[PDB]
Scaffold this active site. Structure first.
Site: not given
Ligand SMILES: Cc1cc2nc3c(=O)[nH]c(=O)nc-3n(C[C@H](O)[C@H](O)[C@H](O)COP(=O)(O)OP(=O)(O)OC[C@H]3O[C@@H](n4cnc5c(N)ncnc54)[C@H](O)[C@@H]3O)c2cc1C
Length: 498
Positions: A32, A107, A111, A242, A353, A439, A467, A477, A479
């Site tokens: 991470e 996220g 979120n 990475v 929302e 998103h 995602g 939404n 997640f």
């Molecule tokens: C302000 C906001 C409000 C939101 N509200 C909602 C909500 O209420 N409900 C909902 O369904 N969705 C919501 N979302 C969207 C949701 O948070 C995302 O869709 C979800 O977190 C995406 O999951 P993921 O596993 O694709 O990636 P992420 O949760 O973005 O996780 C990716 C992780 O990988 C890490 N990373 C990235 N590149 C590297 C690398 N090269 N090496 C090591 N680590 C790395 C990042 O630091 C991060 O911790 C919201 C997002 C935001 C920003």
């Protein structure tokens, strides 16, 4: 060194994958780039609130920023800050700014907690190659339970000052013939009741969410990742980003990994190798790794679909000015509880929302984050000069999303004799924010860049989990969908490949 499985990132796709790998007995290392958020800061809290932003609010910026929609009231609290490994990263592309979490839990740290299953008929439209019965019969329920989704008490919701803002929009939407729905959440609503009663420390009711919640919110560090660590077969290394992925000559994958401190200073570059490699770096991060690997020749067999098919889940923000007799309240819970469901899978679809505002004084504003159905897609294209992915999206590509949001909110304005606000998103008259995304979806689309379980085309034992798999839109939404799809994928991959 070598570890059997590596998972890049610690968001939803990553966390699901690591838990199930660990349960299967596969020693797994998660890498991470952000922090493990567990150290009390200068105020005694882990996270800053929205009224007291500091360096913890921001991933390597030099000034704090007001949450979108709130500049008119929260710019006064903005301050210069040291660039630091803070929790929320506004990533700026040419004509789009994508907000992502940085830390253990991704996220889920930043979120709004809103845990929503997509409409089955829409799921079937967007992912026709996936068996929808197993999703709805098995994987959505599995995600629901693991995530600790819960439901607000309706009597408390009806009575509390903290949700007046939601009730006002419900009444206004009703006059246009539009209904509302309660939104399930991973924030503990029992805890939230006790916040309002002065019985436990406030978080949602103390203007915290987008830079983290010090209490109440069951982010992934508390749910999937805690369980993954509990297997005894998973470890998490933080402040490790990475940078490159290659297939080694003798099989499996090798990674170059930069270790930094919280000031961004490079401490070490490490080579880490594995048998099974799972990408959970998000729509932005996983896609960037793969376009880089293709175009720099370290994964030369990646296909042309890597990078393609990105969309912002139709995200549009807008606001209405209420009549003076419909104040929204000085006290607004930071966790939304209600949405307007006008989503029927047609091009007019909107799921919006009803968003709280953090001002902490009466503004008469109702704020909305609309999710729309807009077929436009962008492409991530690797820039070898700067070694970064660039997102080829133009603002005019959000015109269909703006148009759909505006048609819906115009109905509400007509029924109520209200007007939009035009001043919340900059000095230029602009009622619809059309160049942000919370998103991000796509870039490594399921069945296009990968097989139907996220196995990257051209490679064995190389998986995408997050995602980046989703083709641009889920109508809600996202997640819960990411989580449920990750449960499906890792179960099959372990069965067939591991
Ligand atoms: C302000 C906001 C409000 C939101 N509200 C909602 C909500 O209420 N409900 C909902 O369904 N969705 C919501 N979302 C969207 C949701 O948070 C995302 O869709 C979800 O977190 C995406 O999951 P993921 O596993 O694709 O990636 P992420 O949760 O973005 O996780 C990716 C992780 O990988 C890490 N990373 C990235 N590149 C590297 C690398 N090269 N090496 C090591 N680590 C790395 C990042 O630091 C991060 O911790 C919201 C997002 C935001 C920003």
């Amino acid at each position: 060194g070598y570890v059997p499985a590596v998972v890049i990132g610690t968001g939803y796709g990553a966390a699901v994958s690591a838990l199930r790998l660990g349960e299967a007995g596969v020693q797994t290392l998660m890498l991470e780039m952000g922090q493990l958020w567990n150290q009390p800061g200068p105020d005694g809290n882990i996270f800053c609130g929205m009224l007291n932003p500091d360096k913890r609010s921001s991933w390597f910026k030099n000034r704090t920023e007001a949450p979108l929609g709130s500049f008119l009231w929260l710019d006064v609290v903005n301050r210069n800050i040291d660039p630091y490994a803070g929790v929320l990263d506004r990533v700026n592309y040419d004509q789009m700014s994508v907000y992502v979490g940085r830390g253990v839990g991704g996220g889920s740290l930043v979120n709004g907690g809103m845990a929503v299953e997509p409409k089955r008929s829409y799921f079937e439209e967007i992912l026709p190659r996936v068996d929808s019965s197993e999703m709805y019969d098995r994987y959505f329920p599995r995600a629901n339970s693991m995530l600790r989704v819960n439901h607000i008490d309706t009597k408390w919701f009806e009575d509390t000052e903290w949700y007046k803002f939601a009730r006002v929009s419900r009444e206004q939407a009703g006059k246009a013939g539009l209904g509302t729905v309660f939104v399930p959440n991973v924030y503990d609503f029992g805890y939230m009741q006790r916040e309002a009663a002065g019985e436990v420390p406030k978080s949602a009711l103390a203007t915290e969410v987008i830079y983290g919640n010090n209490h109440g919110k069951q982010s992934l560090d508390k749910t999937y990742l805690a369980a993954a660590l509990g297997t005894g077969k998973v470890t998490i290394q933080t402040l490790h980003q990475v940078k490159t992925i290659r297939q080694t000559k003798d099989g499996g994958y090798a990674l170059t990994v930069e270790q930094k401190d919280t000031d961004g200073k490079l401490l070490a570059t490490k080579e880490i190798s594995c048998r099974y490699l799972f990408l959970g770096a998000g729509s932005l991060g996983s896609t960037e790794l793969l376009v880089r690997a293709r175009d720099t020749g370290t994964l030369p067999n990646l296909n042309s679909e890597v990078g393609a098919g990105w969309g912002p889940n139709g995200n549009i923000m807008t606001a209405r000015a209420n009549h003076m007799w419909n104040p929204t309240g000085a006290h607004q819970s930071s966790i939304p509880a209600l949405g307007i469901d006008a989503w029927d899978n047609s091009d007019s679809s909107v799921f919006a929302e009803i968003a709280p505002m953090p001002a902490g004084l009466e503004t008469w504003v109702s704020l909305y984050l609309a999710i729309t159905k807009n077929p436009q897609r962008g492409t991530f294209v690797y820039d070898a000069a700067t070694d970064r992915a660039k997102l080829n999206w133009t603002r005019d590509q959000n015109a269909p999303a703006v148009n759909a949001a505006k048609a819906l909110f115009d109905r509400i304005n007509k029924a109520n004799g209200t007007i939009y606000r035009y001043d919340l998103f900059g000095t230029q008259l602009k009622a619809f924010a059309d160049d942000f995304c919370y998103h991000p979806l796509g870039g490594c689309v399921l069945g296009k860049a990968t097989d139907d379980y996220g196995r990257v085309a051209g490679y064995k034992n190389l998986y995408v989990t997050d995602g980046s798999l989703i083709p641009g839109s889920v109508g809600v939404n996202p997640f819960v969908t990411i989580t449920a799809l990750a449960e499906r994928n890792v179960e099959r991959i372990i069965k067939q490949d591991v």
